[PDB]
Design a protein around this ligand. Structure first.
Ligand code: 85R
Ligand code: NKN
Ligand code: NKN
Ligand code: NKN
Ligand code: NA
Ligand code: NA
Lengths: 303, 296, 305, 301
């Protein structure tokens, strides 16, 4: 029976389960129940699949237009000339700004309605806050643009990179790619910080040590030697990037100590983030993705 | 055990081997001991020898093809040997093409599960088509025949692994390669292309001008980070060096998280079910080749 | 809870925490109900605040020390006759602060050595943090001595101490469950799964580098340390394979280098596959218990302090 | 412990130790109490000291060999300086040790007579030592023949010996089991995991070489070397510019990189999934078995 499960007009079980924050203990598998799973599957298949594909197509086309507008930028503001190229450029950047403001307004109204928990804003509403950040970046870009500064290009490239990386949102509706995106989100929020809480301190400590040792030269600045030490993580280290110093035994010892420590540090990261292999990762990701698809279904229904 | 291999109507082996991707339990159907013992007996009786001879002939053909290609001087003891090598190589190509056509006539796949099954058949057909386009171009007074021939040569050298079936370890390992490509190449390739394109577009937009201003060059430069050959300073013809550095760093971190979750995903999902799943898939492949060679 | 925390002679916590590693199952004891509840109450009550303050003050110390060391005047032959400037005054104040901190840690280490009175061998299997802090403080003292002995090796001692202290910063990782367990795993892999393959890697590198330098005739590359570095570079993804052609039998050189490459990369493969077979299903609670014991020891030390 | 150690006719230890690996469960069979508890007792009583002395002597031998080789000035002449006398003495000791190893290898093979199929599945360490001795003897032979290939022979023997130190790595639990893991992998996975990689590398090298018209990379050797350098994280992707349209070259290199990375990933996942479970038990059993072989050999010697 479907009575007050969706259309109570006050509170529906599906709505409450969907919009429940991290406070709700057993949410992720709360949809495992058969009455909620079949209903959501039927609704999706019936119309939300088509609506979602249409929205994804429109968004991708928007991103292509924005990319084309940004790539061929003039080398502000710049007065449009009489040419097909100029007309297309102007209309493309107008459309990009029009998308930026629309995203801004959607994010504002979502924030006003939900009033997030002020602690779950990152673990929950990750995608929405990312979209809002993109909108803010582009809005500041245009503000700088019309303020006669050259930092609009910086704020535009930031927004464009954000937007391109935000295409993972639309993997939803696909089983495996959606699960893959869920695993990226979860692993970011879990270890991205934890793993680098010990890697950044190692890098900074050894960078300060080395730069103190280097008496004079090009690399006598903390930033340059920080980059040089970092380059080891890219598998591009030098081991002799400088020669202006004394006691080269100390320098070599420090460099090798850094190498060994960071390699066991990448050994610890790669292994300790094993997650819940087999034991409880073959169902947990599937449940999280199903929950997120339910969120999408409800939002597209109501919108 | 009648109506098993020679019935003129149907048979259990001819049905299981030719089963389409909609059957639930095809590779664990041969698990039954009588079928497994029958197939092993037939193999040891004649298909082992026939398969080994076929493998030797194929390796010979590839040797003659590679030698003829490498010593390439169109159209145009040394020149006699090159010509005979080319003629033999054309014989092999036409032979593989005609077998591919015969198989597709006799199969009529489902048009949707084509790639999952007959992966070797479609690859051989593609190689055959590449090399036939090569010869058409070569006799057409052009030089793209070089490109189409080298593509065919690489494809054939990579197909040489097809014969690894018939050996437990090598067959299982090739089966793992083939399954991972088919079902997971996209899992990592799809997520990685969007990120790379986005960050390459951002960086090139930042770049004021220079050699790397071309989208292709900057995209390749960003890629070079994935093979442990990044530069982090490839260009300096720009401004806002902080934005450049932060974009590159974000890209590097994101690639690390993308390749980490690729490892975690494939490992933690299918570490345990290889010993049985892969073994039974290899058994199915060996059954298919046994039946096909017997019927041929 | 009679005789559980403070009898002025001995209790259960005092002995469980300070029991030497020789004890079979020292770790499981703290999982006993009242013990864990009491430690969690003491922590939340006041040790959270005290430990947070200590972490902040140590971080500030290292900030002041790094700033003073980085701006070291490079003129040669210390000691320096200070020049009247605000920067020079701040630099000398930072030097004083850093030396005072080193001396304080030196007096903490010597006080702790008699306080715990290890058996001179149990000291090796536990208290790594205390030995590390004491050695950092020792480097500081040697650095100042060399500074006032008209020798320039104070820069080497200072950089060693600075790097070591920055690494030791991870000690204050206690009091954060995830971060604490993460650090315990790092030290339990550095100390059990690293040397195992470090011995083998050093043996292989030494053997192959010796062979290669034997083959080489003359040049920059005929030494031993140069070739050892240039064979080690293969491990950090920076291999050359053409770094010298001052030899004979290029086939021998190439085959030796390829053998080395294939051997060291299987060595890293086996590294990963062994360290995964271990420390994954072998150590999750065997690390949580270690973290709990570390935090209990810290709580007891702070309470006694 | 009657009829276990030495009867001159047949003993349980002697039978279990030297018997071929074709038998099913050599590993689990010493697990039983009396054999394992008497083996450990005799080991800790005297064989530990015997083995440590042997290990020290071998280390000294290898140091002497390295010192003699590194300072190589044929045959050569000796001048009036203690350095020359040291060098010749080191050479004499090294060659004497090589001859001893060669004799030991022949003695073992004659006394045990392997099966021509179990010459690698087991007796891994002793055949390596024998081939090292063979390299040393070939080195001296070439040396005295007014040749120059003695440098190659001697460097091969020297590298082989430094690696073979891993045999003495046995006798300690953790290091011994780690060496067992290495040896097992090299034995029963390297061929299968290397044939496929070699096929891919050779195919792509031939393709690129065919596409490349002329230059210093025209030879197959150089192209193969570059395609391999892609595997040590040192690929270039721009190593040539003199060829046909750049597109085909780019699609060849990118396909090569993608395929090799897929190959390594499957390599890892396969030999990891097939092994994770039993390493905790099988590796320990193999280490104990080989220590038992060592104890029996040194007791008989
Ligand atoms: C050489 C270092 C290798 C030694 C292994 C790492 C040791 C380490 O350090 O872990 C140790 C921990 C501290 O935990 P603790 O040692 O006190 O706990 C023991 C308690 O007795 C009780 O619980 C038990 O015995 C048990 O659990 C113990 O682990 O973490 C710390 O010390 C925090 C320090 C982390 C930095 C390490 C220094 C790296 C070398 C710097 C070189 C400078 C180059 C310039
Ligand atoms: C640390 C500051 C750098 C930020 C610079 C902006 C450009 C970098 C790209 C943004 C970094 C975040 C990348 C990311 O991982 O999130 C994007 C999506 O995959 C996450 O999935 P989704 O959007 O929530 O659906
Ligand atoms: C990027 C597309 C152009 C690629 C041109 C050719 C170079 C790549 C080689 C072709 C890809 C094939 C990869 C592969 O792994 O299949 C080859 C065999 O092992 C598969 O075994 P089988 O024939 O199916 O039995
Ligand atoms: C002619 C030689 C060409 C190749 C260059 C020399 C490289 C040879 C490296 C040694 C080969 C064996 C590989 C190995 O694993 O090393 C350790 C050995 O102890 C085997 O272990 P163990 O003694 O059997 O226990
Ligand atoms: Na690398
Ligand atoms: Na590299």
């Amino acid at each position: 029976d479907l009575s007050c499960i969706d259309t109570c007009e006050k509170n529906s079980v599906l709505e409450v389960i969907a919009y429940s924050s991290s406070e709700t203990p057993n949410r992720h598998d709360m949809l495992l129940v058969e009455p909620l799973n079949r209903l959501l599957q039927d609704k999706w298949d019936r119309f939300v699949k088509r609506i979602f594909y249409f929205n994804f197509f429109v968004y991708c086309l928007y991103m292509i237009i924005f990319t084309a507008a940004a790539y061929y930028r003039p080398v502000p503001p710049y007065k449009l000339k009489n040419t097909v190229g100029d007309y297309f450029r102007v209309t493309g950047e107008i459309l990009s700004v029009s998308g930026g403001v629309y995203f801004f307004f959607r994010g504002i109204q979502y924030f006003l309605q939900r009033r997030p928990s002020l602690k779950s804003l990152f673990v929950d509403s990750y995608s929405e806050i990312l979209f809002f950040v993109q909108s803010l970046f582009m809005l500041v870009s245009v503000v700088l643009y019309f303020s006669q500064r050259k930092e609009y290009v910086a704020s535009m490239v930031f927004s464009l990179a954000m937007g391109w990386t935000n295409m993972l949102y639309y993997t939803r509706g696909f089983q495996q790619m959606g699960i893959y995106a869920v695993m990226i989100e979860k692993m970011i929020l879990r270890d991205l910080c934890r793993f680098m809480f010990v890697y950044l301190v190692f890098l900074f400590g050894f960078s300060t040590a080395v730069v103190t040792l280097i008496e004079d030269g090009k690399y006598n600045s903390l930033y340059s030697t920080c980059l040089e030490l970092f380059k080891f993580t890219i598998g591009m280290g030098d081991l002799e990037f400088t020669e202006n110093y004394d006691f080269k035994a100390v320098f070599i010892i420090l460099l090798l100590a850094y190498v060994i420590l960071t390699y066991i540090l990448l050994l610890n990261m790669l292994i300790a983030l094993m997650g819940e292999t087999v034991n409880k990762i073959a169902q947990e990701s599937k449940n999280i993705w199903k929950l997120q698809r339910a969120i999408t279904i409800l939002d597209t229904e109501k919108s």
